[PDB]
Amino acid sequence: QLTLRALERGDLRFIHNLNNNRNIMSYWFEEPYESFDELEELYNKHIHDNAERRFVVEDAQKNLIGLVELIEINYIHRSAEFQIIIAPEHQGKGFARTLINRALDYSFTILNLHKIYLHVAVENPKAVHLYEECGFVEEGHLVEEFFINGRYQDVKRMYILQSKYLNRSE
Amino acid sequence: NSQLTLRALERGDLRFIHNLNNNRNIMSYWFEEPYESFDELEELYNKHIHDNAERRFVVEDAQKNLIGLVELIEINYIHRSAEFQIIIAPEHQGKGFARTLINRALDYSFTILNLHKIYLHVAVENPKAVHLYEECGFVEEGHLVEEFFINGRYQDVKRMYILQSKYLNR
Amino acid sequence: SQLTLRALERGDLRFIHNLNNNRNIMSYWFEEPYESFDELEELYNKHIHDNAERRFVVEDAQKNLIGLVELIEINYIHRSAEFQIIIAPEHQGKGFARTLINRALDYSFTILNLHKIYLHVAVENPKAVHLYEECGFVEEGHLVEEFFINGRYQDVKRMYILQSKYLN
Amino acid sequence: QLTLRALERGDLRFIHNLNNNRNIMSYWFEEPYESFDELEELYNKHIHDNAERRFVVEDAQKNLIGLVELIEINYIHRSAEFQIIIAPEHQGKGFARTLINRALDYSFTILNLHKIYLHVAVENPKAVHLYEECGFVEEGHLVEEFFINGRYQDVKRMYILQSKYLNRSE
Amino acid sequence: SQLTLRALERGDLRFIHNLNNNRNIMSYWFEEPYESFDELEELYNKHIHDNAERRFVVEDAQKNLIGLVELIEINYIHRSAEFQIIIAPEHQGKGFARTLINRALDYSFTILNLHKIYLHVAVENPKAVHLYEECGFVEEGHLVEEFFINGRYQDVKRMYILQSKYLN
Amino acid sequence: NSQLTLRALERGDLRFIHNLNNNRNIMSYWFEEPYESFDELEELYNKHIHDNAERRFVVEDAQKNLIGLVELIEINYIHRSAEFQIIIAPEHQGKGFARTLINRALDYSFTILNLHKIYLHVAVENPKAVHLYEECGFVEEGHLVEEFFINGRYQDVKRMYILQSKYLNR
Amino acid sequence: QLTLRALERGDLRFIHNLNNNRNIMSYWFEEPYESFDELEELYNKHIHDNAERRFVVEDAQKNLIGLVELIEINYIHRSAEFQIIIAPEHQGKGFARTLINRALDYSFTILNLHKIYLHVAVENPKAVHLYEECGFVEEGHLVEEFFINGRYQDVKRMYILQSKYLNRSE
Amino acid sequence: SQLTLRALERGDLRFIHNLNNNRNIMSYWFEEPYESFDELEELYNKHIHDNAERRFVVEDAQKNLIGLVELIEINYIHRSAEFQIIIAPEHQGKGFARTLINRALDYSFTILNLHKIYLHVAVENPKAVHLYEECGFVEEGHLVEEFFINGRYQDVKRMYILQSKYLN
Amino acid sequence: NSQLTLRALERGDLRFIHNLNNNRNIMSYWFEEPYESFDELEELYNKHIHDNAERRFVVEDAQKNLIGLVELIEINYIHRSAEFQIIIAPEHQGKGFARTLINRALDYSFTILNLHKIYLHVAVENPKAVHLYEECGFVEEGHLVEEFFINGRYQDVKRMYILQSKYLNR
Amino acid sequence: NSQLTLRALERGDLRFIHNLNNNRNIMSYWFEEPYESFDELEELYNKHIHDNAERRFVVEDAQKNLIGLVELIEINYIHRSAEFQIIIAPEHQGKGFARTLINRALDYSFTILNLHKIYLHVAVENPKAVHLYEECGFVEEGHLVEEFFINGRYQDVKRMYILQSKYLNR
Amino acid sequence: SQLTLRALERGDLRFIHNLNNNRNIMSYWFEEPYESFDELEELYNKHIHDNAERRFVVEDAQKNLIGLVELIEINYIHRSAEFQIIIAPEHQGKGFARTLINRALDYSFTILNLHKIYLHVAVENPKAVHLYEECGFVEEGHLVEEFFINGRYQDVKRMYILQSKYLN
Amino acid sequence: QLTLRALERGDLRFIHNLNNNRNIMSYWFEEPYESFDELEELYNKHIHDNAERRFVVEDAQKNLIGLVELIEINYIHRSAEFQIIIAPEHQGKGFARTLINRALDYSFTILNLHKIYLHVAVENPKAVHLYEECGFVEEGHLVEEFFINGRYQDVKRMYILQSKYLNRSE
């Protein structure tokens, strides 16, 4: 029922809405301010940048569900950072696990990456737990790494390896 | 009240900005010349799309009437300071929006941008505005003598500030 | 209160093009009455950010375009500028010049903080000379054969007014 | 009833038609081939070129009657070449003399030129005679100057001076 | 006679975008199935004048887009090129491949004056290998763990045909 | 007949040119590859707008149906020569337009461009076209051996010419 | 004995040395890091910028003594910020007062400015006192305005007016 | 015969830079005495092909640079220009001004075919006013508080001479 | 000791940097590929002249021998963090410069740039370097699993940090 | 004599050209203003490197002294005409080089460029030059009235020509 | 230990130009032996930042240039690259090839983290084929009439080695 | 003893000398005028043009002997035009046949071309004969193809095929 596809110029109004939402951008440790023009100019700049893959998530109806991104893709170390956003209107419909799996399938069966890692607020224990259920393991607890809502907060760095993902069941 | 929102300035808001920027009585509050072609406005908007030293916001109510403008300018990377400036459109002056909007600007400065100090300039000959700012936590740190040429003569201005520690501990 | 000056905009260029291609009108500015819309628009573009001029269109309360007022050669150090004005043919003879001249001076002296505004006017236009005198300008020069206009060289008055005089 | 005005981009389709007409271009010693794109690109190139003035001729109805041009304007010698075309549909309505006078008025009373000259085929004696009636005098008979319709042809160069034009009647 | 090859055009890019973002299809070309329309269109623009490739869309008599055929890495001296073809899902199983393969060879050999056409095909696609053999291609290589596809490295056949064989 | 006209190629004629340029049976007569995207065609058209070494014409009948193409290429400034090439669209082949169009091209070459020599190439294996050109005054000056690769083999072509003096004295 | 002249490209090595000196840049509230290339590229950028005047100070021997700058020159308000540096090797030779006077003469008798202001650390009372002796008066005491050597510090803003400078003695 | 005017060249810019940064000299031209060599050289470059000015350096027989003469704001239609001249400090008081003024007029009137040359001169420089009168210039304006110079606004004479007067 | 100095990287230091960047044993400490043409180095240096997100320093002794390199990268404007990296040239390893240089980098970060947190990466399999950093006040916040490909296999790295408040209060 | 050679103008000849172009007495023969900075000369030389409408030559003797300049300008592609102009440097005037150089220019025009007609302009008030040209085969085709402003007044000029057929059959 | 690979630099281009214009040498790479220094240098410039290749020059202990080694068509996903090597004529026959081949493999497998290195070698060069076999490469293709070389089409072996085999 | 190698920028002075020599350029039907700047700019333009190969000929001493070029290389028809120049000082030393063979070897054994053709004046029978001895055969006698030294002249077009060159001896 859910499909990941490449980000397109016609999806930019959707991204713009997310990028200016304080409560969504807080999960990505980003400032919730971006004019359409900054957004669109940065999109243009990175069209041919091989160090990132940005995906939009659609349901069968072709409602826009959210965003998945693989960034800082490094081709010697074969690692990338994974980050995901599910739009407020679709939060709590049970789609996260499916989309995490899609991202990992893409990473490990298409791009042939070795390692995917992510950052998650220590004060978001529900997401830490979801990630662990999907196979990620804590490799760091970064102290006062990000300033979020008036104070410095700690974050977990978590990872999963291609070997585990592909071979755990063997 | 909670009805008001601050959001990034967008290209579709420029006709509203053009109107304020060509209004002598609105520009006088910012000590700026009330002359700007749409082309100058737009080309400067284009020039500063990626300028990290400013944040320009448009104020809207629940029905999306444009209420005014809030800007943080001269944002400094080391000293962690910025200048706050505001414009409430004539038809909305005196409604009680100002205190709310000042608090929103400070929240953005202190809880998102992680700045140390916000300062502003306001005319000595506008004592009721000075009073309002005092009630909002700003304190006078300077009284600049004959600083700006306005309406045929030079005027004095107060320089007023507030620090992050004070805002966050009130 | 009825007449207002506002910055020249791209949508006003057809009006300007019309005045700029009118022989009678451009003779008051000592300018050649030929300018394609492309030359006009390209020069407009070129000077968007030029701090040395301020070009204004005059509008009545109904938003009819009445004329143009310009402050040019604005100098940073000397604090002087040249003033020029055109009232469209369909609106001359309605007594608007005085109001418009005073608005230009108010702008120069209360907003731009200039020290001196000067202008040039044909010696053969004594009515305009008299009007400028009534508004406080005084002759400081009688330029001999300064401009070629309709087959002959003509003389022009240079007239000025200071900030100190205007504000007092 | 006739008016000369600056050539505009919206008159280019009219010029294009003239510029591709063998029997009209022969009077100007030009090749009758010009794509709209060549025409338009050359127009663009010369927008700010002070060495030429191109005019379109209209009647009161605002029918396009023809073209008058002053080219190779030199500002030390104060001379320019005059050339005119009346569209086929308006030839023989007696407009040439009026338009020659307009061009001379412009040259001598606006641009303050000293001398206007023109070239006319020796085999176009009617035009040589019209020009003489309007004050031009032959200063040259250029031998085999131009290749026109399969052979080299001779042309008259003719001129008029500002002094004569302005002062003849005095 | 029903199917035709013609040059790829800008109006065909939505069709290509669809195939280029389809995982199943792009697996036949050993390519990553992600390409924004902007990347596609920008690369199209970049290669307009590139003599080293010829990209074709396949159309039936009704002008339905059936697939794509490409001649790439066309070499000037060696007179070789790589052939690749995609038939859209909605049109596979209709027996068009043979016709299309022959059209690509006709183009290469009767129009471009090439000496050799080669292709790559997954060892795990024996039906495609057999089809290419029927059309005159012969295996010249069995490339070991050449491409990573769906979580593992796969082997591919390299197959070729010469102009001399095709024309005789 | 006199119904046919030659005129400069224009941007609005390019869809017609695209059609001919992608037709294998039309391009074979010019020894050119029948593949050209509209973008290649248009960008090359743009590139050559001001190229004085060619003249490209479109043929139209009285009702403005597009009949074909005539081109003079490789026009040389010193040697006063050019290559003539023609295409009559399939639906108009065999109507008797060709002789007229060849005469129009020669008239343009000799009476307007003042060229000395026009030459052309035509397939030896198309003897009836060779004959037509002979009837039109062209004479064979070469028989180029295996000059062009066409349809899987090399073909010979005649090189045929006509001089200005012959055309103008017939 | 001392002369102020425009900054030149051959003075850039001198400026580079000052700009990378922690104890000199602290007086200007600037970070003491600037590659020659950043310096030179910024110089190039600002060649025609009318909002600043940068001067080098020489003695009769043509030793480079220091730097004087007028920045943020505003031509409606007629104000500018003054800042000065005397090289370490020339500190304490009694040149500051002379160079302050030179700067004020330039400001008020050449550029026709109305007001010059400066910023000086509250913890640099000797300089505050020198400035007062030269006619500047405190108009502000800016609280925690700048981060300097591990902590936020206060600064005085001080000014002098053209009227006072020119007319005090009258 | 000893003194000559020739076009300004790139190798003369150090001389100009020196005069342009000299307070006493630039006061005669009502200009700010600050110009980096880069601003000077960049402006020189910008105006290489500008037809509205002619800048000259003055040389004696030994090729010593004596001064500068400029014809600026040359107008195409009105056939007027402004003349300005500087004689380097080391060469003032040698009586060269008269010769140089006449050379500038010869250029304007016998080469550029101008109708009018005008200049501006400080009212507080009566010796220069007298010299220009001796060379045929006459006052046509007394501009009030036209330029700010050394802390105060000063008046300047505008003076002119016509081609007809010069050639006869 | 006090003999060592940090200063901005300059173009004349690039041959020294080229040497380190092409040394497999030096680059291994930074998890980077030891291949960089002088042209790549120089062009990237040019590209980043005005990049405010990094500070690159060269270390010199009293006699100006080049000792090594210190860099603060990924400097963030909001979170007030940066990554610290160091290289001591082979001939100067083991001399006792490292502790000094680490303290100099922290002083710059905390007393000039006003950063909140400095972190670094160091190989788990280089325990003595880990120990040194611990003695210098860094604490382990992560142990990144198979993070980098080095010499034919993946290696783990410690992520270690220090905060401004700790450095400034020691 | 046969000692003289014509060759293409080169960049290393521009100082010689600068000298002639700034000489009032040399430029008067061409009716041009004797003012040209080296930069104007050089930049125009650069602009016209590929201009096919002119051929500029430098004259040298056997010992390579620069003798003068010969130019063919306004070379027309259809009409097969050009304007001939010459300058003999002052020190070489009166030596008998002129007739030779005129014949060399005509040989180039008629035997290499295949032009039909060469014309020139020469002052009516320089009758001995007119005579020389007549002896060289040029014939007067015009007497242009007050064509050029020279030395304070307008002067008349002869327009003289020679045709290819006459030159080639003498 | 005597021989080293280092990145190609601008100062090494004369050496490369010499090899690139040598017919005998370039025949081993199936390349045309013509390249002006300007084409070479311009292409070098173009590819400075191209991540898909690594070009190396080989030096002995005395810094004499011995040869060139290149890793090209480096692929991001498949983790494959093509290896090619040239030893200058004056240095062939000294037994350096083995060392250099192993250095290229060490780079590919221990630094670039590649999965597969392949190469092409003329069937008519059995000595080179044997040397590559000794270094662990195995034939995966025999490409028929792949390259035109000295008047005829020649066959080439494609040979490969995997990371797993090299590291174990 | 003779070697062909790619043309280089340091050979341009040699080419310039040839390109300005009337008696050498006549063999190539080119105008003998080319400034160094035109030459060098055209060289630059064509650096990457795959449709030509330009070679210089050296002897063992590394004297520059002449030039060989393959131009208009077409990669579908596999044909190119061959042209050669031997410098005047080396004419008649018997090098032509060797250099023709070198060019043919390059064409047919390196570039894999099918056909090489050339143009040679009918009035240069010695060269026609040399070419025939080297295997070229006349395929055309082009009538009044080129204007050379005051009149139109005829030229032979001659060719040789790869099949003949490679297989004649088999």
UniProtKB/Swiss-Prot annotation, chains B, F, I, J:
Return the PROSITE patterns for the record: GNAT
Residues bound to spermine are M27, E32, E40, H48, I49, H50, D51, E83, F84, Q85
Active-site residue list: Y133 (proton donor)
Q: Does the keyword Plastid apply?
A: no
One Gene Ontology BP term is: polyamine catabolic process
What are the GO MF terms of this UniProt record?
diamine N-acetyltransferase activity; magnesium ion binding
Substrates-to-products reaction catalysed? an alkane-alpha,omega-diamine + acetyl-CoA = an N-acetylalkane-alpha,omega-diamine + CoA + H(+); spermidine + acetyl-CoA = N(1)-acetylspermidine + CoA + H(+); spermidine + acetyl-CoA = N(8)-acetylspermidine + CoA + H(+); spermine + acetyl-CoA = N(1)-acetylspermine + CoA + H(+)
The UniProt site entry described as Could be important for selectivity toward long polyamines is assigned to E83
Summarizing activity control, the record says: Allosterically regulated by polyamines. Polyamines trigger conformational changes and induce the symmetric closed dodecameric state of the protein when they bind to their allosteric sites.
Residue numbers binding spermidine: E32, E40
| Keywords on record | Acyltransferase, Cytoplasm, Magnesium, Metal-binding, Transferase
Q: Where does acetyl-CoA bind?
A: 86-88, 93-99, 126-135
Instruction: Kindly tell me the pathway this chain contributes to.
Output: Amine and polyamine degradation; spermidine degradation; Amine and polyamine degradation; spermine degradation
Origin: domain of life:
Bacteria
Q: Which PANTHER family match?
A: SPERMIDINE N(1)-ACETYLTRANSFERASE
**The protein's name in its UniProt record:** Spermidine N(1)-acetyltransferase
Instruction: Name the source organism.
Output: Vibrio cholerae serotype O1 (strain ATCC 39315 / El Tor Inaba N16961)
Which taxonomic lineage is given here? Bacteria, Pseudomonadati, Pseudomonadota, Gammaproteobacteria, Vibrionales
Which gene name does the record give? speG
